[PDB]
Amino acid sequence: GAMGSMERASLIQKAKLAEQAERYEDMAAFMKGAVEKGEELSCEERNLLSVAYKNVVGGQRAAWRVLSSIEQKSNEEGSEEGPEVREYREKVETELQGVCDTVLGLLDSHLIKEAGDAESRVFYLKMKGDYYRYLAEVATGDDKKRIIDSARSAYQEAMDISKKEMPPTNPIRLGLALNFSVFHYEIANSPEEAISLAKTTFDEAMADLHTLSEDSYKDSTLIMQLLRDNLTLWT
Amino acid sequence: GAMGSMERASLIQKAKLAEQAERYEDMAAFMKGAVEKGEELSCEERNLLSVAYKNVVGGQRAAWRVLSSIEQKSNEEGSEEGPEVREYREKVETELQGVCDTVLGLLDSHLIKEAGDAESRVFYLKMKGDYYRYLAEVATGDDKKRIIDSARSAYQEAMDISKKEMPPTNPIRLGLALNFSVFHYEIANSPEEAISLAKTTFDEAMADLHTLSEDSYKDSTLIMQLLRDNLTLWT
Amino acid sequence: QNKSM
Amino acid sequence: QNKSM
Ligand SMILES: C=CC(C)(C)OC[C@H]1O[C@H](O[C@@H]2C3=C([C@H](C)COC(C)=O)C[C@H](O)[C@]3(C)/C=C3/[C@@H](COC)CC[C@H]3[C@@H](C)[C@H]2O)[C@H](O)[C@@H](OC(C)=O)[C@@H]1O
Ligand SMILES: C=CC(C)(C)OC[C@H]1O[C@H](O[C@@H]2C3=C([C@H](C)COC(C)=O)C[C@H](O)[C@]3(C)/C=C3/[C@@H](COC)CC[C@H]3[C@@H](C)[C@H]2O)[C@H](O)[C@@H](OC(C)=O)[C@@H]1O
Ligand SMILES: [Cl-]
Ligand SMILES: [Cl-]
Ligand SMILES: [Mg+2]
Ligand SMILES: [Mg+2]
Ligand SMILES: [Mg+2]
Ligand SMILES: [Mg+2]
User: Fold this and answer.
1) What's the DSSP call for residue B42?
2) If you take atom 16 of ligand 2, which residue's CA is the nearest one?
3) What is the DSSP code string of B1-21?
4) Nearest C-alpha to atom 6 of ligand 1 is from which residue?
5) CA–CA separation, A15 vs A29, rounded Å?
6) Which ligand 1 atom lies nearest to the CA of residue A44?
7) What are chain A's domains?
8) Are A137 and A93 in contact (CB under 8 A)?
């Protein structure tokens, strides 16, 4: 590994620096090296990892969607014919799949099996689900169903742990629920399940708000607002 | 070259696709391959090249400035001490210098010597000046003066050709003047020259506007507005 | 645009 | 922010 000669703490520091500079590819490389040091990650470190790879793969997904729309247009009725569009969409798609495989390899070697506390275990299983979902977004062949089911399984195990070990307003539980609802709506062709999950999540969080101190849950009300945005869009 | 096996036209097409997807690193690689095919570039192709490398190196410059400000803060009075900040700023800086060297190598091999028309010759000399200026922005050692003078020389040769072969409202001449004024203000420590150049450029373009058709100079009024922004900031 | 986090 | 193009 290119980072095997840098101190873990130095990798964390440089990941924060890269975050400040919005150099998310560097951030991802640094946090990958940190993970490969072999020690479990603190709450702050998991956040850095997730943020870095989320931004990298988000850019990749947006580019893939631009190119896929162009490709679809190029295969309509009356559209003038070469292979360039397909080739470049395949290039972006292959790079995207590489990043997703890298993150899943990190989770499987060996973040999840050493994750014993609810916070971290749910975090990692949500991330596994997220990246299998990103793989599902572009899958078209004999593996689509298995990729979708891997995403579902990871999300479901995370849900079972969060419901049992976390309060309804925990930001991790809320983000997991948001993304699992988006899985149901956009991947699993199950919009009614997506709506039901979003509504139940929002209602339970709403009912638990009264136990929280004010300045200590900005992210939770933020994510409840995202749940409400999705509900407004879908109904 | 990784692109030596792709058709020139395919490289151009994929550069446009990458522009649409805002994948500017891919755009730069494609236009580099196109250039290395050995044929001169059309007006539309030069634009693709310049846009791609401008966006790549602009991201690099913004990151370098974030990191350099952090570095400066870390060397103030009462600031707590490691080498990580310096190291990562050096990493971004070295990558930036690599991109600048690549563009200058393209211009020198062999775009400029084959550029015989005013439009293309001025375009390429402006770009040479721009990338030597980007190198100057980060230079600190025994080469700073020579880098600054290379930028000045390229800009000045482009200016002499544009004044003699182009009308005052030509977008290329106006952009050259804008960037040469910014060179004077920010690199050459010559703010009075920068202001004089900006004002004279704007006034001559203003006086020549009456010769143009309306929908055919959006870029020229845009660049005149940028000249006025700089004048407002500097005075 | 589905909201995710 | 100096304007360049
Ligand atoms: C600045 C450094 C980092 C840590 C990278 O990002 C800061 C953010 O990191 C934390 O927020 C997390 C978190 C985000 C919050 C929802 C953002 O909240 C606000 C108001 O900005 C977005 C991030 O992507 C992050 C790290 C992602 C996770 C997500 C990961 O799934 C695998 C699940 C839900 C969410 C949880 C972990 C959030 O708690 C903090 O609790 C937030 O503190 C505040 C001000 O609300 C801070 O915004
Ligand atoms: C969409 C494809 C490309 C070609 C990449 O970009 C489009 C743009 O490309 C051309 O514009 C050029 C040009 C830009 C214009 C100033 C933008 O104008 C508007 C209203 O958007 C910005 C670009 O960076 C570009 C290509 C850069 C150059 C610059 C290069 O120096 C080495 C010198 C000045 C400027 C000249 C070449 C401009 O003419 C066209 O004349 C513009 O046509 C319109 C609508 O104004 C179009 O915006
Ligand atoms: Cl390709
Ligand atoms: Cl580094
Ligand atoms: Mg494929
Ligand atoms: Mg608990
Ligand atoms: Mg250096
Ligand atoms: Mg002429």
Assistant:
1) P
2) B219
3) -TTTTS-HHHHHHHHHHHHHT
4) A47
5) 8
6) 4
7) 8-235 (1.20.190.20)
8) no
Closest partner CB to A63 (pick from B14, B23, B87): B23
* Secondary structure of B189-221 as H, E, C letters: CCHHHHHHHHHHHHHHHHHHHHHCCHHHCHHHH
- Does the beta carbon of B151 lie inside 6 Å of ligand 2? no
Residues in chain D: 5
Ligand nearest to the CA of A168: 6
Q: How far apart are CA B135 and CA B148, in angstroms?
A: 8
Q: Is the CB of B70 less than 8 angstroms away from the CB of A10?
A: no
* Cβ within 8 Å of residue B6, ≥6 positions away: B14, B33
Scan for tokens 């991330």, then name that residue.
A127
Resolution of the PDB structure in angstroms: 2.3
SS3 annotation, chain A: CCCCCCCHHHHHHHHHHHHHCCCHHHHHHHHHHHHHCCCCCCHHHHHHHHHHHHHHHHHHHHHHHHHHHHHHHHCCCCCCCCCHHHHHHHHHHHHHHHHHHHHHHHHHHHHHHHCCCHHHHHHHHHHHHHHHHHHHHHCCCCCHHHHHHHHHHHHHHHHHHHHHHCCCCCHHHHHHHHHHHHHHHHCCCCHHHHHHHHHHHHHHHHHHHHHCCHHHCHHHHHHHHHHHHHHHHHC
In the block, tokens 């373009």 appear at B205
Residue A60 CA to ligand 5 center (angstroms) comes to 14
Whether residue B193 has its Cβ less than 6 Å from ligand 2: no
A183: distance to nearest CA of chain C, Å?
A: 10
The pair of structure tokens assigned to B187 is 């690199």
Report the C-alpha gap between A207 and A190 in whole angstroms.
Answer: 26
CA distance B45 to B66: 32
* Helical (H) or strand (E) element with B112: helix B112-114
Tokens for A212, please give them: 């929280």
Instruction: Say whether B85 and A17 touch across the interface (CB within 8 A).
Output: yes
Phi-psi region of D3 (alpha: psi -120 to 50; beta: other; left: phi over 0): beta
Residue tagged 């880098």 (tokens):
B147
Chain B residues within an 8 Å CB radius of D2: 182, 185-186, 230, 233
CA of B50 to the centre of ligand 7 (A): 25
Experimental method reported for this structure: X-ray
Q: Which helix (H) or strand (E) holds B144?
A: helix B144-165
Asked whether at least 3 C-beta pairs link C and D within 8 Å, the reply is no
Mind telling me how many Å the CA of D5 is from chain B's nearest CA?
A: 6
